[PDB]
Design an enzyme around this catalytic site. Structure first.
Site, short mmCIF file in Angstrom:
data_model
loop_
_atom_site.label_atom_id
_atom_site.label_comp_id
_atom_site.label_asym_id
_atom_site.label_seq_id
_atom_site.Cartn_x
_atom_site.Cartn_y
_atom_site.Cartn_z
N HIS A 192 63.93 -66.70 8.09
CA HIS A 192 62.57 -67.25 8.06
C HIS A 192 62.59 -68.54 7.25
O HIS A 192 63.53 -68.84 6.50
CB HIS A 192 61.58 -66.25 7.47
CG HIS A 192 61.91 -65.80 6.08
ND1 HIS A 192 62.85 -64.82 5.83
CD2 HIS A 192 61.43 -66.23 4.88
CE1 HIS A 192 62.91 -64.66 4.52
NE2 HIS A 192 62.07 -65.50 3.91
N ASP A 228 67.77 -65.01 -1.79
CA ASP A 228 67.60 -65.33 -0.39
C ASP A 228 68.86 -65.99 0.15
O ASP A 228 69.36 -66.93 -0.48
CB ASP A 228 66.43 -66.34 -0.22
CG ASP A 228 65.25 -66.06 -1.17
OD1 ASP A 228 64.32 -65.33 -0.74
OD2 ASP A 228 65.26 -66.51 -2.34
N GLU A 242 59.22 -60.49 5.41
CA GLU A 242 58.45 -59.24 5.42
C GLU A 242 58.25 -58.75 6.86
O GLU A 242 58.08 -59.56 7.79
CB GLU A 242 57.10 -59.48 4.76
CG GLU A 242 57.27 -59.76 3.27
CD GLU A 242 56.01 -60.03 2.51
OE1 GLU A 242 55.03 -60.54 3.11
OE2 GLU A 242 56.00 -59.70 1.30
N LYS A 301 61.48 -55.13 3.63
CA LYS A 301 60.40 -55.55 2.74
C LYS A 301 59.08 -55.37 3.48
O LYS A 301 58.83 -56.00 4.51
CB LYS A 301 60.60 -57.02 2.32
CG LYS A 301 59.67 -57.45 1.18
CD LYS A 301 59.91 -58.90 0.77
CE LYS A 301 59.25 -59.25 -0.56
NZ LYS A 301 57.81 -58.87 -0.64
N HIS A 314 46.71 -55.70 -0.14
CA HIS A 314 45.82 -54.89 -0.94
C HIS A 314 44.34 -55.18 -0.70
O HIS A 314 43.49 -54.36 -1.06
CB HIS A 314 46.16 -55.04 -2.44
CG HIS A 314 46.20 -56.44 -2.93
ND1 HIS A 314 45.07 -57.13 -3.34
CD2 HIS A 314 47.24 -57.30 -3.02
CE1 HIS A 314 45.46 -58.35 -3.69
NE2 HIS A 314 46.77 -58.48 -3.51
N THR A 362 55.85 -54.06 -3.21
CA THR A 362 55.37 -55.10 -4.10
C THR A 362 54.09 -54.61 -4.78
O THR A 362 53.72 -53.43 -4.65
CB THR A 362 55.22 -56.39 -3.31
OG1 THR A 362 54.90 -57.47 -4.19
CG2 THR A 362 54.17 -56.29 -2.21
N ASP A 420 54.34 -76.20 -2.18
CA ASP A 420 55.68 -75.63 -2.25
C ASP A 420 56.73 -76.73 -2.48
O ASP A 420 56.84 -77.68 -1.70
CB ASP A 420 56.02 -74.85 -0.97
CG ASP A 420 55.22 -73.56 -0.80
OD1 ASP A 420 55.19 -73.05 0.34
OD2 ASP A 420 54.62 -73.04 -1.77
N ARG A 458 60.01 -64.39 -10.83
CA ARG A 458 61.31 -64.89 -10.46
C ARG A 458 61.96 -65.47 -11.75
O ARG A 458 61.23 -65.85 -12.69
CB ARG A 458 61.05 -65.98 -9.43
CG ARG A 458 62.21 -66.58 -8.73
CD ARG A 458 61.71 -67.50 -7.65
NE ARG A 458 61.08 -66.78 -6.55
CZ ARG A 458 61.70 -66.45 -5.42
NH1 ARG A 458 62.98 -66.78 -5.24
NH2 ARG A 458 61.04 -65.80 -4.45
N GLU A 477 58.75 -54.76 -6.32
CA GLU A 477 58.64 -56.05 -6.96
C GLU A 477 57.24 -56.22 -7.57
O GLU A 477 56.30 -55.51 -7.19
CB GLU A 477 58.88 -57.16 -5.94
CG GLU A 477 60.27 -57.12 -5.38
CD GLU A 477 60.59 -58.10 -4.29
OE1 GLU A 477 61.83 -58.15 -3.95
OE2 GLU A 477 59.70 -58.80 -3.79
N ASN A 478 57.09 -57.20 -8.46
CA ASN A 478 55.76 -57.73 -8.78
C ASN A 478 55.31 -58.70 -7.70
O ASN A 478 56.12 -59.48 -7.18
CB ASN A 478 55.73 -58.44 -10.16
CG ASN A 478 56.77 -59.53 -10.32
OD1 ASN A 478 57.96 -59.27 -10.16
ND2 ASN A 478 56.33 -60.75 -10.63
N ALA A 479 54.02 -58.68 -7.39
CA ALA A 479 53.44 -59.61 -6.42
C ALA A 479 53.25 -61.02 -6.97
O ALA A 479 53.48 -61.99 -6.25
CB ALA A 479 52.11 -59.08 -5.91
N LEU A 480 52.78 -61.13 -8.21
CA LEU A 480 52.39 -62.40 -8.80
C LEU A 480 53.11 -62.60 -10.10
O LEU A 480 53.57 -61.64 -10.74
CB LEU A 480 50.87 -62.45 -9.00
CG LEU A 480 50.02 -62.40 -7.73
CD1 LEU A 480 48.54 -62.24 -8.07
CD2 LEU A 480 50.26 -63.65 -6.87
#
Length: 487
Positions: free
Chosen positions: A89, A49, A182, A291, A296, A338, A97, A416, A376-379
């Site tokens: 963003h 980022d 996104e 992105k 889902h 993703t 976070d 990540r 990407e992977n989501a989780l």
């Protein structure tokens, strides 16, 4: 036999604190040590980022690239390629976070007298993570529009980072287009009144978008039309509402007009910002990308309610992703999707969730429009099953023994990097995954060379883009399991 055309690049996303919240690069030694583990595993590159709130924090055009140039030099000196996100963003801001980086304060100050610079919901709540697409072309920010700010940021990035572009370090520019980078509305605000798997809400109540809707409705002779009111609230399920229930008012003439308007405005937002990005990076050997969020939940019910509120007008008979893909085509922009690691069986039943089928739909739409598609992977996942699901999606038809496969991901980015990833059993599993993604070949520094970026082709109208919505086509066939599992 020659399996080279099967190789899929693997990138790893850097930590959200790669650069400190004070725009200083303070973790170089730790990162160098982690990157040695990624190099030991054969990784192609990293992704990061590039936070607007860090770089343009002082005031208009006062760009401070010091920390990012230090980071990029370290990546170059590790032998790794780099994908850069133009991150317009907020980072973080949700409960729990650790890394919190707002958009520039001087931008937010405009919101004191004009709170409609923010996406707004039906009870008036302002989302402060991103500027509404309604102000894309409004000169509200000390004389600049939001699109001008985005273009100027990208120009300064190109000028400052030219050495890394010319050296072949920076290979991809992902253009952030909304919250979380996104191309979506902030329809699922975790921490301010949404919890998974709520349907979410339409976030189109800022005065600029209300005026836009009124003008659109006037143009078609329906000045009386308004946004739907029978839509429930964030944490509803579809049958709680008259709009989203099976056989509900989403199907009506007014419903269709609203849903098209809402989803079209994201498409227009992406088109205009990508045109600017293409002009900035013209002639450089890079991939521009967007992105698309992976929504889902509720994919299994007729209304696809959560996709609708996010801004993806996707129904059984209407391909709400192939329209986006058609818009991308003139730019030769790619899709970064993703959910690549998810199986439907891993989701809760009540969420009516179909990540596998959603992935197949998005990949197929991009491929039918001639696009590169990455994922990407989501989780967070560290286990062999996750890596095998990714492998399936990376090469849906498996390996071609003597040439390129019919379809393949252009790349995969793992979310990540952390210390946890690169030790113990987690690291062993990750290394083997990279081998399999590479079709058991060594890393190829020369793979997937890019031509100098050509100028975007002719602008096409929204009506031309929407020809891609119907007829809805079945996805390309995907194998149930990879033919090259981790074991």
């Amino acid at each position: 036999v020659n399996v080279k055309g099967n190789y899929v690049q693997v990138y790893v996303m850097l930590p959200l604190d790669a650069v400190s919240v004070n725009n200083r690069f303070e973790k170089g030694d730790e990162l160098r040590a982690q990157l040695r583990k990624l190099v030991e595993a054969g990784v192609d590159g990293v992704m990061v980022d590039v936070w607007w709130g860090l770089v343009e924090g002082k005031g208009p055009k006062a760009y401070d690239w010091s920390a990012y140039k230090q980071l990029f030099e370290l990546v170059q000196k590790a032998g790794l390629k780099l994908q850069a996100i133009m991150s317009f963003h907020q980072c973080g801001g949700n409960v729990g976070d650790a890394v919190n980086i707002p958009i520039p304060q001087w931008v937010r100050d405009v919101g004191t007298r004009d709170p409609d610079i923010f996406y707004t919901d039906g009870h008036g709540t302002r989302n402060i993570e991103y500027l509404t697409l309604g102000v894309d072309n409004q000169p509200l920010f000390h004389g600049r529009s939001a699109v001008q700010m985005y273009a100027d940021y990208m120009t300064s990035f190109r000028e400052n980072m030219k050495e890394f572009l010319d050296a072949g370090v920076i290979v991809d520019i992902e253009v952030g287009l909304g919250p979380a980078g996104e191309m979506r509305y902030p329809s699922y605000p975790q921490s301010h009144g949404w919890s998974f798997p709520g349907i979410g809400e339409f976030i189109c109540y800022d005065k600029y978008l209300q005026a836009d809707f009124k003008a659109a409705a006037a143009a078609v002779g329906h000045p009386e039309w308004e946004f739907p009111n029978d839509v429930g609230q964030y944490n509803d399920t579809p049958e709680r509402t008259q709009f989203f229930r099976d056989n509900g008012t989403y199907l009506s003439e007014k419903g269709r007009f609203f849903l098209a308007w809402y989803s079209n405005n994201l498409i227009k937002h992406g088109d205009r910002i990508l045109d600017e990005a293409n002009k900035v990076f013209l002639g450089y050997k890079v991939q521009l990308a967007i992105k698309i969020s992976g929504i889902h939940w509720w994919y299994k019910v007729p209304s696809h309610a959560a996709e609708l509120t996010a801004g993806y007008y996707n129904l059984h008979d209407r391909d709400g992703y192939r329209t986006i893909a058609r818009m991308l085509k003139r730019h030769r922009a790619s899709i970064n999707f993703t959910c690549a690691e998810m199986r439907d069986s891993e989701q809760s039943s009540q969420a009516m969730s179909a990540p596998e089928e959603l992935v197949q739909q998005v990949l197929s739409a991009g491929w039918r429009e001639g696009l590169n598609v990455a994922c990407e992977n989501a989780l967070p996942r560290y286990d062999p099953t996750a890596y095998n699901t990714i492998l399936r999606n990376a090469r849906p038809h498996g390996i071609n023994q003597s040439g390129p496969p019919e379809h393949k991901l252009f790349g995969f980015t793992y979310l990540r990097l952390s210390n946890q990833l690169v030790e113990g059993q987690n690291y062993a599993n990750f290394k083997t995954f990279v081998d399999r993604m590479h079709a058991n070949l060594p890393r190829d520094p020369y793979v997937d060379p890019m031509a100098p970026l050509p100028r975007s082709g002719p602008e096409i109208s929204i009506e031309m883009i929407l020809q891609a919505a119907q007829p809805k086509l079945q996805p390309f066939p995907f194998q149930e399991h990879t033919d090259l599992p981790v074991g």
